[PDB]
Write a protein that binds this ligand. Structure first.
Ligand SMILES: [Cl-]
Ligand SMILES: [Cl-]
Ligand SMILES: [Cl-]
Ligand SMILES: [Cl-]
Ligand SMILES: [K+]
Ligand SMILES: [K+]
Ligand SMILES: [K+]
Ligand SMILES: [K+]
Ligand SMILES: [K+]
Ligand SMILES: [K+]
Ligand SMILES: [K+]
Ligand SMILES: [K+]
Ligand SMILES: [Zn+2]
Ligand SMILES: [Zn+2]
Ligand SMILES: [Zn+2]
Ligand SMILES: [Zn+2]
Lengths: 365, 363, 365, 360
């Protein structure tokens, strides 16, 4: 099996000097800090461990190419794009919309290459050039709506790829399965009225955004019943996550019969991530990818692919990400340095949410 | 009259080696520049105290080093000898647990850390101060009688309690530790002793993974005088406040300690990487206010707060400031992220209530 | 009685977004976390003052903001207003020289910096203190009447000079700048004024590249009362001390100022990236000592030191500490680099420059 | 066809402990997050080769570990044994400033093997030239001792390989790192089969070696040439040194391989020198080397990374050398001094040109 791997040095050049929840603000006494949350070193360490662990030998490198305006404009409005162009034009950079999201001088080039990364991987998976793959792209995508960039996301990478698989490669049912610890409100908005894209987001209840991602947000029109949120409570771990994957997401995908599954693969649900209270360990992420690999092999011949979302622990993210790479290559080259107390047992209030979400599968056809 | 202990040397801890993710080429753990226990976190706290204007309400206390005699009231010579040996190596070295590291001459800072808790204790018992905050480093609550571990060389609060007992003649002392990790060192040091009541509220099963459960109540004459509240992952201000009101405050009232020492960690904060708790800065203020309140009711406001863990350089300074503000009565700066876990949940309540039964055995 | 001016806000300057190497994707200047003017350099100076015991021989002096009036004695209203413009912006901005940057609310640090030089000046002039050191930040000596530049928003030493004259009644002040770069701002501010003798010893043609020559000597009432000493790249203790003993001290003796103000930068040190000078800590100590001595000989010891530039986080603390030991007399601690790396001999082409400058003394009256 | 050697592991060197400014509470040297030899400096260089598009003109070359035998062609067993011992621990290796993390010998092996891989492909004709962006550096290690961030003398290891395995009889090592290549000088001191040239800042490091009178011994008298430039020297002194000493020494000796020890610590922003070389000075130095390489041995020269300590400016100095080899200039120096040739500088180069007479 050829397993694609999308990486480019530019992904590690996102400018995070300004911006963020804790931007320097002398008036409010927020002291300048050296390492901001979305500092590029977290995903760079992931890439660098892929190299030095030998997993790269089982992988086929895939060079990304810039997405075009037309690729972006299939899901995003011209207002959003021209805004990102004009902010990226300024010297020193600029806020983009929600204050937290920063676009540096010329930063749009990285957003273009990031989105094209997801498209290159898609093109190679649907053609048969590759059985699956991992696109370690940055900046992330899943918070960008039809109208707005937010949450570090300029463009909705996975949605741009799903619209590419549909509008150019002729697919008719796609599923975007997003396990980033925050709700994928961007993806949910883009496909809100559309049943040709099943969108699923499992996430921490009320984390980001604080007012979206609830069970009863289900789509509308032709889209009703083709958006599914699993909002787990803080503290959930491998127990809750695997239970959710087995009772809800895998039966949901079996029902919908997608011809391509795109995983929004974030790792901010990790046990050490500063922007969650979830307890997923790297082996949990391994079992998560395998379940998705497996059901994909059952139905659409392994046509699935993983695209990086968030993740903020420079220490532990590389091993979470490497664990998912191993589930694609089936070679174990290296142990988790934390190879196990907390989060592995399924708690009844964690179960009460997943049982509720399992009833939603009946409305998928 | 509110003391504040700080010294520049507390921010000179060398954190280049060690950590759970200490560089290891064979295991492919890449060197990183910012380890978890980097000095920037507690340095940003002390600088916010300065630039928020709180310092105008605070009486600075210069710390002096603890003696060997002060460390030996609670630690075995083996522990102290070990730290002198490692502190002597030219490059420093691992203290024993392959996580804690002590730089060359780093024992100087460990003495100063403990002495800072002793200077605050001296001045509060004597009446020179009403209460205070000692922002010391390295922290203490994981050091047992025999073993340094978890970034702790010396058990600062225990050294302070022992000093208050054996030198200042106190008979009854309580240590209240709200660091998110079980204070296993304090538990071990006073296991057999009813004259220091030890209470740890912490995340169930975080660190160390083999301690902190309800059934660890002490031994011998000390049975009933160690109390653990292990909250579930995800607990926030509602479980913590509820725990302080149904367990910790009734317990102190019953025990009637001549002095309360709080081990003030902030790694239970909503943003800390080493916890899954959701306490906010407002949450920490109330917890502090409740200890003052109970301290003013039963022993004459004789309480003080001694820094333990905390690893979020963005949000810890505001959690520390909120505790300082609860000591001064003066609000001077808003928490910038306060725009959650404020609702108490059945499974958090069930732990807290099971713990309230244990108050009966405190006499 | 030795004053020491420090404040935590001096280490809170926002420097993650600007400078010669500001992030520019188009030019492929990759984002970096430590810029040249990072506050850790001067913070480590202050912390070494604390941890060495020198603080026990010093009188801490608390700074208060300079007013607009203090700033306007030497700067055009456009400069002051342009500082408020940039400072109020969310996330700051370029002050208008593509190198200098003002954080959000950062004008408050600018005010407190000039305030720190005023407060030491007041306390020294009034006899309350004999001398002192103001470890202020940002530096000042590049700011002209019209323009902020080179990390300097306000000319701190010139604002303290103008305060001593127009409020405390002094008629003769001398500003001696040993920052490795030319004090173009001090020279410009007092170009036409003889009541402020301005001396700058610098690296010939570093920053600005178009000033600092011997033939710049003032105009009007000010002719002969500006003195530039442009030493060659490579100069160290041998040339710096010869320049002090043959030009700067004789010029001060001839001038008989009521107060001597030292712009004390440490960027001429052997390890500083932004110069090619080889001064060591013992050189900076002797330089401070010579000023102290001529000042105790003529104007009753009325001199003080205001921090300017310096960019070696490893070595600046010991250079700055060495200057304090000249003030306090107390040797607490040894320079951990004592040396044979060069510069202690006075080379011929270095004397050629100093000797020329010594002729300019004849026109100081 | 131009080779480029890089491996992710070269940026995994552990620079947390050690250094001339290693933390020391009794000397009150405060711990610092960024030491002088931090991997970021050479990682940025590599990442600029990627993002500038120079990589599209380059042939990537995977490095392979030098073997113990490779090391022992030029180093004593004690040096090698000392490194395995220090590497097995969870330490300092020789001169206090050189530090080797646990298992760090793996990277030193990979560093020397990188300079061997480039050398093989350049001799074989598979490549015309190339650049080996290896770490840790090498030119300070002698037969007996590692020192100055240098575990193994990479360029000397590659020169021994080119001779014993590949059959070359004359090799030249040109070292333009700002510090004296005392290691290389020591390894080939009695040997005329390796012309060793070092241009460095007079008395910088080590403070006690690098002088003109140090010309070799025995068979090797006349085949070691030191050019010790005065502090403050720049593009002027350096280009005059190359046109008037280094190139003519190389034309006279006629080596079959030129190995450049390529350091950028002579650059205008480096904290560890007082030299004023700019990115165009390095490009010009590289170009003179290629020019004489094509005139006298068919373009058989290669560049091996030594020192350099400015994360901001080093990447553009290294890009400038890559641009020289590729002939494709796709990016400007954002900073673009000592372009003038000073008499005390010329006095040094002039005395050195006299030395070319004893090269045969
Ligand atoms: Cl942030
Ligand atoms: Cl760590
Ligand atoms: Cl910069
Ligand atoms: Cl260093
Ligand atoms: K999600
Ligand atoms: K949908
Ligand atoms: K007890
Ligand atoms: K605790
Ligand atoms: K003047
Ligand atoms: K100057
Ligand atoms: K050299
Ligand atoms: K030789
Ligand atoms: Zn996220
Ligand atoms: Zn802790
Ligand atoms: Zn300067
Ligand atoms: Zn070097």
């Amino acid at each position: 099996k050829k397993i694609g791997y999308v990486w480019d040095t530019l992904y590690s050049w996102v400018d995070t000097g300004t911006g963020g929840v804790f931007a320097a603000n002398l008036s409010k006494r927020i002291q300048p800090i050296t390492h901001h949350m979305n500092h590029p070193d977290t995903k760079r360490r992931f890439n660098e461990l892929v190299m030095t662990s030998g997993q790269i030998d089982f992988l086929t490198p895939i060079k990304p190419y810039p997405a075009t305006d037309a690729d972006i404009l299939r899901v995003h409005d011209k207002q959003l794009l021209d805004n990102a162009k004009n902010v990226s034009n300024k010297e020193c950079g600029g806020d983009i919309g929600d204050r937290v999201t920063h676009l540096g001088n010329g930063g749009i080039e990285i957003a273009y290459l990031s989105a094209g990364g997801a498209i290159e991987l898609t093109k190679k998976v649907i053609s048969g050039e590759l059985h699956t793959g991992y696109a370690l792209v940055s900046p992330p995508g899943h918070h960008a709506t039809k109208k707005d960039s937010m949450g570090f996301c300029i463009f909705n990478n996975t949605s741009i790829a799903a619209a590419y698989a549909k509008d150019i490669l002729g697919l008719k049912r796609v599923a975007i399965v997003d396990w980033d610890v925050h709700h994928g409100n961007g993806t949910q908005d883009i496909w809100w009225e559309d049943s040709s894209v099943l969108t699923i987001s499992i996430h921490q209840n009320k984390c980001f955004p604080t007012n979206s991602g609830f069970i009863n947000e289900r789509g509308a029109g032709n889209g009703f019943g083709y958006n599914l949120n699993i909002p787990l409570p803080p503290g959930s771990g491998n127990g809750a996550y695997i239970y959710a994957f087995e009772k809800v997401i895998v039966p949901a995908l079996k029902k919908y019969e997608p011809e391509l599954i795109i995983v929004g693969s974030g790792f901010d649900a990790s046990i050490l991530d500063p922007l969650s209270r979830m307890m997923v360990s790297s082996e949990g992420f391994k079992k998560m990818a395998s379940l998705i690999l497996e059901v994909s092999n059952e139905i659409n011949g392994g046509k699935c692919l993983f695209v990086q979302e968030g993740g903020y622990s420079p220490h532990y993210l590389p091993f979470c990400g490497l664990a998912v790479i191993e589930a694609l290559t089936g070679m174990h080259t290296l142990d988790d340095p934390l190879i196990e107390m907390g989060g592995n047992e399924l708690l009844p209030h964690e179960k009460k949410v997943v049982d509720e979400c399992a009833n939603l599968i009946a409305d998928i056809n």
